[PDB]
Each structure stands twice: as C-alpha cells, then as structure tokens.
Design a protein around this ligand. Structure first.
Ligand SMILES: CC(=O)N[C@@H]1[C@@H](O)[C@H](O[C@@H]2O[C@H](CO[C@]3(C(=O)O)C[C@H](O)[C@@H](NC(C)=O)[C@H]([C@H](O)[C@H](O)CO)O3)[C@H](O)[C@H](O)[C@H]2O)[C@@H](CO)O[C@H]1O
Lengths: 38, 286, 237, 247, 247, 38, 247, 38
C-alpha cells in the first residue's frame, strides 16, 4: 500500500479463525459425544 | 472453541459400536443446538486426510466483489427547453438485488468501500466524444448542485474526481464512515425523535450523495450518457448471519413482500411443488 | 440435571422441571459497559435489583389456528416497573436480557413452538410499497402477532430462522425455553424509545393438537433485564 | 525514467480484482471497533447450523404446513412414509435452507451432510422409523427391503426427541457440481427415504396423526468453490423508490 | 523494460489525492522561515476558544443587540428567561461561532461543549439563575421544575462574573452527524434553557434590565470528521474584478 | 519524492503538535483549577 | 510518482509471451493433486517410443495393408525388396509416426533415429536380409553391391524376431531443417534400402509370402527446435456443433 | 507474481525431469544390453 491511509489497502483475505459453536452450540452446558442430550 | 481452520476436517476410521448408555445419533433439537453426531459415530468410516481448502468462503472473499449499485442514463445536450447534463444520487445498496441479498445475509457489517465508476456514451453518426466528467462526493443531506454549471462544483472541500470516458473506469476508496462501529444492514427502529419518521432507515447507514456532471458544455447534437457505479467492500467484519431473502424485493426503503404469482418463491410456497411427499423428482429411469 | 433449572435475579426466581438446557446467544453473557468502549461521559446509574429482575407479561392463548406472537425489546418493558421508569427518565440505556418462555400441557397434547431471539428484526409490510407505521411496530407489553410467519413477516423465512439464538418448546419434551441475551447493537448504548435491539418470536411450527379434554393452553413470557445502565438523566418522556 | 510496457489486461476493470486505491477522505479516523456478539468469519460457519427442510412441498400444503411431514398410525406393515430429493444445488426440499442457500452462491461442493428429524407427536405416542440414504446409481427405492440395504439409522421415539441421519460424503470425484442436469454423474447425490420400522402407535386421547420436522446442515468436512450469482433472487424492473434516490 | 498494467483510476484527477509533482522552478530557494506568533496546527485548537452565541436572533433585534440576552426584574417566580437550540450543525444561535463555523466544514462530531455566560449588569445588581441542559427525547422544558431534572448549574452573580454550563458528550453513538434533519436520532443534541433561580434584584439607581453575553466552545475531548464544503458561503456570479484579472 | 526539489514532495500530514493555550489562555498569570479567577 | 516511458511493443499481444495475469476467482482452492500413471514432462519422451512406418504407401494397399511389407521367396539373387524415403519432415512412410508427428510441430531437428523390423512369417521360415542407410549425396542405390557400402546391418531371422538399423546422426550442420524442399542440403537425410542377403526360405506348409512390420523412433540424443503449426491438420469451415455452443 | 493467488503466476518452464522408460521399456524384467531379449 503506497497510500498514506491504511483503509486504502488491498483486501485482507488471511483471517482463517472460526468458532462455529457460537451458532451451532450456544448452550450453556456443553453436550458430550454419545451421552443422552437430556 | 475458536481456532484456525484452513482445510475441511479429516475423517478418522471407526469401528463397530455396541455400547449401552451411548447413543451419538440421538439428539434434542429443543436445546437449540445443532446435532453433534459425527460421521464416525453414524457409520463405519475410513481414514481420510482432507486437503480441501476453505478460503473461497471467507467473508472477505464472499462479499469482496465489485457489484453494480447504480446505473443512470441521461441526455447530454442543450437543455434550453429531467437530468440536465448532471444528476444526483443518494448512495444506497438496496437498488440492485444481487448485492442487496448478499449484504442482507448479515445483521451488521464493517467495511471500507472501493468505488469504481464506468461511463459509456451513444449518439442520439459522426463519432463518440471523449468527455470529461466530475463525480463529487456530497455528505448526507448536504448541499448539492442544481445546475451543470453552478458554483457548487468548485468543490473546495468535498472530494471530487475528474475522469475521461477514454480513461479506465475511475476508482477510489470510501472508508468505513459510519458514526457507529459497524453499519446496520437491518434497523428495527425509527430514525427520529418524533413518531412520523421512516421505519427501518438509520441515516447513519447512508454513505452519502454522489453528484455527477459532464464538465464539457453541450455539443451541437445530443448524446445519451450512462454512468454505472460499482462497490466492493473490503477489510470486512460481519456479525449475526440471517435467513436469506426469498420473496422478490418490492422497495429499496423496506422489506415489504408479496411473492411471485406462482411457486417457486410465492408467499404461500417457497419451494416448487412435487406431486406428493413420496414422489421423487428427477428419479433415475434406467 | 439439564432438565431442571432455577433462575434467580433480584427479588424474583423461576424454576422449571422440564427444560432443555438453555441458550446463551452467540455464546456470550451480559456485562456492564467497559471504560474502553464507553462514549457517554456522565456517570451512569446501575439500579441492579430494581431493574435486573423478571417481569412477566400478559399471557396469550395458543390456539389451533395461531400464527405466532412477538415482543420487541426494550419496547415491551419500557413501561413496566423501575426498568420502565429509568427508561423514561434517561435518554440512554443498555442491558442484556434473560428470556424464559413458558408453556405446559398434557402428555396427550402435541405441538412445537420455535422460540427465537431475532436481532434487528425489521418488519416488512405485506403487498404494498408503504413501509410499516409506528403503531405496526411499537406494541409494548401486549406484543404483536405474525401475519405470515412462513416468511417471518420480512420476506425471508422461518425455515432458516434457526440461524438466530433459539430453543423449541416441543410439548412431549419440555415446557419452557430459556435464552440469555447480551447487549446487541453497533453502539455501546441507545435511545430505548425508538430502537429495539431484539425481538422475541414464538411461532407454532407444529400446531397444538390432542384428542383429550380441550383446555385453554397459555404461553407466558417472563423477561429479566440484565446489567442495566442508564445515562443522560432528565425528565420523564 | 524507468522503461516500461503495458501488458494485455491493462486498463481493464475486473470485478474480482484486488488492489489498493486512492483514499477519498485523507486523514479520516474510522470509528473505534467495539466487540459485537456473533461475528462470522467464514460462510462455512453458517451452513453448519441446521435449518428446516421443506419436505412437504406439495399442492394443498400452504406456508408452514410445507415445513412438517405428518405421519399416521398405519394399517399395513413396512409402509413408505416419504422421500427427499438430495441435490442441494437444485429446487426441492433442501433449497431454502442455510446450507442450500449459501451453497447456491457456489458451483462446487464436497462434504458430509446431516439430517436431523424431531418427532413432535405427544409424549404417549411411540414408534420406530428407518431413515435411509441410498448412494446414486439407480431408481429411488420404494420398499423397505431395498432402502434398508443403504446407509441408515433406525429411530426409536423417546425422551431424546431427535435422530440424525448422516449423509456421508461418498463421491468418486473430490467435488460434485451444479450444471442444471440433476441426473449428471457429477451432480446426483442419491436419495433419502423414510419407512415405518414398526408403526406409530398412540392411545385414544393422543392425536393419531403426528408431525416430524426435518433439518439439514453441513458437517465441518464441507467445502464450497467457484462463486456465482445466486439463482434465488432476480429483478425485471427498478425497485420502488430506486429512481427517487435521484430526485 | 518493466512489464506493467494500468489499474482502474489511472489518469483521474482526485482533488483529495496526495502525490509529489514536478517542481516548476528548479533550484528555487524559499525565503527562510521566521518565528511568527500564533501558529495553529490543528483546527481543534481554534474551536476551543469561546465565542459569542447569537441567542437573541429575533425580528426587531439588530446587529449587536442579537448578541446579548436582556433579563429584567421579574414580578412572578421561577420565570423562564430563554432557551437555546443546540445543533451546532444547523442555523441558530450556535452557527456563527468559532466551533460552529469550523464544525460546519465537517459532517461528524463528538465531544463536550461548554457555554459560559457573563453577567453585564451593574455591581449593585444581584441574582441567581439556573442553566439547564436537557438530553434529547422529548419536547423542550418550559418550567423550572422540569428543566431542573437535567444537567445544570445554579449561577450566583458576584465578583466572578461568569458561569460555565458544561454540555457533556452524551450520545449513544460515537459521533453525531448533520443530515439536514434536526429531529434525527443521530443529530438532535437536546436543549438548553435558563430560568430565574431567585430573581434579578437591583436598587433604584441601577438599570433594572441587564444583559448576559453567552459564549460557547468545544472542550479538548472534541473530534470532527468527514470534510465537506461549508453551507455558509456561496456565489451566483463572478465577483467584481474577477474578470478583470484576465485583462 | 523522486524530484530533486524538496518542495515538490507529497503532503506532510504528520505534525500532531498543539498548544491551544496560546489562544485559550493567553493570560500572563496561569489560572488554577477551582480557585476564584479574580 | 515514478517517472516512466512506454517502449515499442507496449500494448501488444504476443501469443508466446510469458507473464502473470489477474486471477478470475480469488481464493479458489484447486483440487488436490493425485498420482496418475504415465506422466510425461518432455515431448522427447514420446518420440523415443517406436511406432509403425507406413512403408507400403501404394495404390491398391488399403488400411493396415499399408503398414506391412510383404516379402516372398525369390527366384533371383541379391534382390531389392523395398526402400524408404527418410525425411521425417515430409509426407512419406515416416510422417504418421510418433517421432514424425511431433517433429512436424517443429522446424529443426538433430539426433539418431532407429528403425526396428519384426519378421512375422512362420517359425519354419528362415532368411537373411540386409538393411542399409545411405548418407546423402547421390541417387538411391538399386543394387546390393552399392547399398552395402553404406551403414548397414545383416539380419538373420530366428528366435529374436526383430532387428534394429541405427540411422546415426550424420550431418554437416548441428541441425537439419524443413523448408519444403526435399532435395535441400540441409534437409535430405539419405536413404534406407532393404535387399535379400540370402533369400526367404520356407517349407511347403508355411506361407511363402511373409510380412515385416517396420518401426521407427528417435534415440535420446535427439533435439527439436522452432515450434510451428503442424501441417497435418486443418479446417475450412466451422466444425459441426461449434455454432451451437452459442445457442 | 504480485497477485495473491499462486495460479496467476507466469509459466513454469523449469521441470527437466524425465523417465522415458515408463513408455519405452515398461517390461517387468529389465533388458540387458547385448543379451538376447528372449
Ligand atoms: C432450466 C432447466 O434445466 N430446467 C427447467 C425446469 O427447472 C423448470 O421447472 C421449474 O424449475 C424451477 C427451478 O427453481 C428455481 C431455480 O432456478 O433453481 C428456484 C429459484 O429460487 C427461482 N428464482 C426466483 C428469483 O424466483 C427460479 C426462477 O423462478 C426460475 O428460474 C424462473 O423460471 O427457479 C422450480 O423448481 C419450478 O417449480 C419448476 O416448475 C421448467 C419449467 O417449464 O423449465 C425447464 O427448462
């Protein structure tokens, strides 16, 4: 980026962080594999 | 819970299961959690080292595309006796459905916007003039020009970009300029302290006005000039994904819906009909 | 173990013996506004127990042909108790919410309610280009009803509404749903009388049915604001 | 100066290009970031959430009635209850789902899918169902004896209200693709069928017709490629108010 | 040579661009710098100086009469003396001030404002006033009992001639903005009202009508964003002598 | 700057020095917080 | 900015240029590589495989009859059986071979060639042949006494069914070239002739006319230069279905 | 390559590896020079 303002830079396609559980498992008490959910 | 994912997850080989008290295929949808049954627990699997990448679905790439947001045609001529050699456009991302639906897959979005302006001309034949245009960014509800030649175009502080039709499309980046930490793609409220204001329109989410004029004085003949504006968001952060739009859009000012006349995407039926729940469409007839 | 639960805030408490764990929206939990995110510089008032407690709204009746109900927050509580008073006397407010929806029946009854907390649920009007009016949106404590739950009254779909924080009340399984909501907005605080952060929607995807004695089956909503903060003190609006 | 020469492609405007460009407002200080709940960084996170399949997409079924499949107490044995076409890239029960909608913004896909069904009858209602996934090759099975030969899960109604049928990624090629031909060897996923394993049995005071709600989602071994415009939205005219933005 | 390609934006003239350009006069030696009093480096320095508000912007008030508010000995109690609209981005008592003029070259603003009033009656005149700042939400208060509930300062006339009412930055959003709609939730700042706390009291030989001069300024927690052309100046024709510059 | 004359260079937007007091408090004797001004 | 200037050649599109160019699909993840049998990295690998020469390219010889040379029991001695023109860059027995086809995508060549012949008569058939390579300069030899003076191999039929005649690279210049003139000093390779060394001799129950299949290939001292379009394929009209690709 | 995607790079004309024998001598038992093939 040769511009003085950082927002002028090219895209940032390097954020590979993920946390699906905030959407897939937003339950307060974690569910263990194989164990009855209820 | 959070981690770095660069490829689809691998599969581990699994054996036969016959354990009392262990029922991985049973779940409870009522909890609101999505099933956590793994393939390895549902069937016997083999080991697979999966190298499939996941970068094309990164939000930056998913929304990182220059999409058409404005298209305006006007007559460039002597307007002695309508857009008189210039126009004003209140910027919005709700007029073209492809970009709109994608942005609306999210509740909040923070991004800088790369703007690209493409111009084409047609004679109303003796050749096409290489005109110079001026695109001036005028803030929200701010003072816009009323004539092709008003003093307002002197642009003392407003940013203006002058470009020729023979040059590549003009381009510049408008920073994330919301007064908040992110733009509200949806707004369940009223923009004013009184009760008669507009619903669902947060002024804070309107980038501004784009005033475009042909700088050249009119020629002896008339031309049709079309200006297309494209927007590409970058340095994107997105929050709270949402149910995709199904009903055709009706207005740029709201989420009003009516549905198609017949399925698919009719208010009464989103998916097209099949004869019955035991009728397999596209069944293989060998 | 994950079927029984007691919620206690302020002078209020609620228990359920037929729960289904409980949801923490986006895996978050309510909290007070930190100094590094604050904007309004006046010292805020943090009422605690007088506002962070359960407020039970009037019940609604689940009928065989019901389309669903909704309550917008904070609108639904803007005129209830000390939370309502603080809201009326202050220009700015901030809070999370603990939602508990209740509905019991019989082991001979069937039905399934989707209980979802929708952020920024901007309603759309049906078959017209005119945007919804103030009275179509601000229902207060009474809440409203869905005209076309199939598309969430916004041209999208209830089918994909599970992308939002939610639980279900499936009569043969549980009799209550619990969802904890953190402050959800693009600003650290907001004017409570013109913007609703969340919309609680309760929709019967599977209608109420039985062949046993017919009885009125109510659905009740109890909501407790959490970590309330108010700024910009003046007279009551 | 520096000697240079322009290459083919010079001056073009590629909508997917990636370059820096002139800042319109120099020295502009963007609003500070604030933590906001629910940040999503990869669309794959969204399709892992299960959503409702419109299995009852039939004439006579209106609105939400299309989102549930009713099963009744049977008089005959081994009865077929319903089937579900599997191309998440074509119109059908799977199209208007989170995984279906997002996948349709792409052309290639790979990974396991999961179908979860929640029984919504009364507590006094019991039953066993068999859900089968039949890899491609032939005609959809119409009898339990045939469907039973494929991938399946026998579901017993009880306290845990839902069952999950995993549709494992079973393909010759790394990815499957959409090409508008549902019978193409690189598109057809096979079939899902549901039969009574035993029967739905209920007492006199319980409804004798109960509903199931089917959900679907991608597992984390999923991958999508080749972005394209979605066929699920389109316009013929200007939207209302669009032109007023110029007045 | 070096292979290159032109990007979109090539050849354009952006008035806010920032590049070096050919020196017209090579080897030119600019006049040496000399220290000069009053250097200003950030416009925020200028708006921190308080200037006079035109509170008496009413028909019948001419010139400087508009810059002072006259208060008289009252016959009734708790009397409302005057109010002041607060949008430093719209026409009103605050527009032609240092903070108002400079702020109007921008679109977004944030920070605390300060209003200082100087009592200019005679030494023998006494009194107590209450200045109130009412955050937005409702209609402007018209009674002291209501205004008193907001942010305020009770002012006692004495040797120290001036009082300061701080209008703290109280906003939901980081910044407020101008959009020509004074009632917008992102624009309205609220109100400032002034009532008699007691009364203006003076002896027989002192004037029984006295003036206050109100000033306003930004504090150093102020910030302005998004430059735009000011609405406070404009032209329809060439200025006199402009064309003569070509003769 | 590839030009030989320094005045041809791009803008200099890095001077964050300030001294408001030369305009806000040009009084010979400093005013202490809280203390009566006169 | 950087001072620059465009050189001649700027803006041109050279079909053999080598530059990077804008990726159409950013962040696209290509399918993982998999090992596949038979990878070829240099076309020279392909021309080293021997293929059948069409030696019997005569009127009356149809299809596969053109790929074999029949020899019969002779009544006279030292009989000439056949000859083979050698320009792998012109039409003749060597053109439709692996080395011939690939070489014709080039203009210059260098290296040794190898001709292998397989005798396909019956086991009871015997014989000796002499295969001769005559470097260029004169007319093709028509008698064994003359051909015998060049490079040659005397072949005795037996258990090992095939013989190889090496056509060593014998040229004044590093490379030979095609220029459509078969008699050019930089093109003509010389000749290959085959005579009976003794005679084909067979018993009463064996066929008295037997076939030979001749193969040719390049050795690893081969080199090809100057790519050009092959003269072996061409079109006058659109192929069937080509225009339908636009419908 | 100034592009972010590696597939956008210029050509790769540096792979000089070869193994003609996979085409010229795909026989299970190697043939020795001079020795009768059969
Ligand atoms: C093109 C092809 O290969 N086959 C055509 C049949 O598919 C078609 O029958 C109809 O197909 C419809 C397909 O569903 C979509 C789709 O394209 O996937 C669903 C989209 O959401 C919808 N988009 C919008 C904005 O409404 C889209 C759109 O309605 C159509 O493209 C417009 O025609 O359709 C669906 O399954 C219908 O229920 C089904 O009857 C037949 C019709 O004669 O023509 C075939 O060529």
């Amino acid at each position: 980026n040769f511009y003085k303002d950082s927002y002028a830079a090219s895209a940032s396609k390097q954020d590979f962080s993920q946390d699906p559980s905030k959407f897939t498992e937003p339950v307060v008490e974690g569910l263990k594999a194989g164990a009855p959910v209820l | 819970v959070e981690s770095i994912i660069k490829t689809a997850t691998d599969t581990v080989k699994s054996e036969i299961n016959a354990e009392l008290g262990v029922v991985p295929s049973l779940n409870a949808v009522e909890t609101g959690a999505t099933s956590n049954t793994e393939p390895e627990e549902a069937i016997q699997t083999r080991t697979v080292i999966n190298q499939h990448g996941v970068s094309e679905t990164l939000v930056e790439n998913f929304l990182g595309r220059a999409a058409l947001v404005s298209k305006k045609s006007f007559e460039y001529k002597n307007h002695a006796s309508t857009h008189k050699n210039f126009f004003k456009w209140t910027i919005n991302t709700k007029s073209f459905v492809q970009l709109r639906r994608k942005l609306e897959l999210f509740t909040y979005l923070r991004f800088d916007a790369e703007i690209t302006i493409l111009t084409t001309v047609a004679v109303n034949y003796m050749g096409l003039p290489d005109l110079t245009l001026q695109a001036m960014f005028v803030p929200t509800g701010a003072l816009t020009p009323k004539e092709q030649d008003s003093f307002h175009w002197q642009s003392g502080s407003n940013a203006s970009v002058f470009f020729k039709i023979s040059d590549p499309p003009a381009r510049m980046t408008i920073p994330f300029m919301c007064i908040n930490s992110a733009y509200s793609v949806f707004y369940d409220g009223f923009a004013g302290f009184e009760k008669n204001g507009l619903y669902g329109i947060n002024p804070a989410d309107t980038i501004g006005n784009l005033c475009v004029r042909i700088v050249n004085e009119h020629q002896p003949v008339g031309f049709t000039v079309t200006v297309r504006v494209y927007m590409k968001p970058k340095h994107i952060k997105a929050w709270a994904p949402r149910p995709p739009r199904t009903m055709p859009y009706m207005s740029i000012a709201n989420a009003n819906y009516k549905g198609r006349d017949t399925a698919p995407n009719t208010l009464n039926a989103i998916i097209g009909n099949r004869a019955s729940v035991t009728t397999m469409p596209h069944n293989i007839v060998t | 173990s994950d079927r029984v639960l007691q919620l206690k805030l302020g002078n209020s408490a609620i228990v359920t013996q037929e729960a289904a764990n409980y949801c923490c929206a986006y895996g978050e939990w309510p909290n007070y506004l930190p100094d590094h995110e604050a904007v309004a510089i006046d010292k805020p008032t943090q009422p605690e127990t007088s506002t962070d407690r359960f407020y039970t709204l009037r019940s609604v009746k689940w009928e065989s042909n019901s389309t669903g109900w909704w309550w917008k927050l904070p609108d639904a509580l803007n005129n209830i108790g000390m939370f309502g008073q603080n809201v009326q006397y202050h220009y700015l407010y901030r809070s999370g919410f603990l939602i508990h929806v209740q509905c019991n029946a019989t082991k001979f009854h069937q039905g399934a309610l989707l209980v979802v907390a929708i952020p920024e649920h901007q309603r759309g009007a049906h078959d017209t280009t005119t945007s919804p009016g103030f009275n179509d949106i601000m229902k207060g404590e009474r809440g409203g009803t869905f005209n076309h739950p199939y598309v969430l009254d916004d041209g999208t779909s209830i089918a994909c509404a599970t992308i939002f924080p939610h639980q279900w009340i499936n009569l043969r399984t549980n009799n209550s749903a619990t969802i904890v909501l953190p402050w959800m907005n693009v600003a650290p605080m907001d004017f409570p009388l013109r913007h609703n952060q969340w919309t609680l929607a309760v929709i019967p995807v599977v209608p109420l049915g039985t062949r046993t004695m017919s009885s009125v089956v109510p659905i009740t909503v109890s909501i407790a604001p959490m970590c309330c903060e108010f700024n910009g003190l003046r007279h009551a609006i | 100066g520096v000697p240079t020469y322009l290459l083919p492609g010079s001056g073009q405007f590629l909508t997917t290009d990636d370059h820096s460009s002139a800042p319109v407002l120099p020295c502009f200080n963007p609003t500070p970031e604030m933590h906001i709940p629910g940040q999503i960084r990869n669309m794959l996170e969204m399709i892992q959430v299960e959503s409702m399949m419109e299995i009852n997409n039939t004439d006579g079924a209106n609105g939400m009635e299309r989102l549930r499949v009713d099963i009744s107490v049977q008089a005959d044995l081994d009865q077929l209850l319903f089937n579900i076409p599997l191309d998440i890239q074509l119109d059908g029960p799977l199209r208007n789902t989170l995984v279906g909608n997002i996948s349709r913004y792409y052309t290639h896909w790979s990974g396991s899918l999961e179908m979860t069904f929640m029984f919504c009858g009364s507590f006094m209602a019991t039953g066993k169902l068999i859900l089968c996934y039949t890899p491609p090759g032939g005609s959809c099975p119409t009898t339990r004896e045939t469907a039973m030969l494929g991938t399946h899960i026998v579901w017993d109604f009880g306290l845990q209200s839902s069952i999950t049928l995993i549709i494992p990624w079973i393909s010759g090629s790394h990815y499957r693709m959409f090409n508008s031909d549902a019978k193409s060897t690189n598109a057809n996923v096979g079939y899902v069928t549901c039969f009574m394993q035993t029967n739905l049995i209920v007492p006199s005071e319980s409804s004798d017709t109960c509903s199931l709600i089917g959900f679907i989602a991608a597992k984390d071994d999923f991958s999508l490629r080749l972005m394209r415009d979605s066929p699920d939205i389109g316009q013929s005219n200007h939207l209302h108010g669009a032109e007023a933005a110029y007045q």
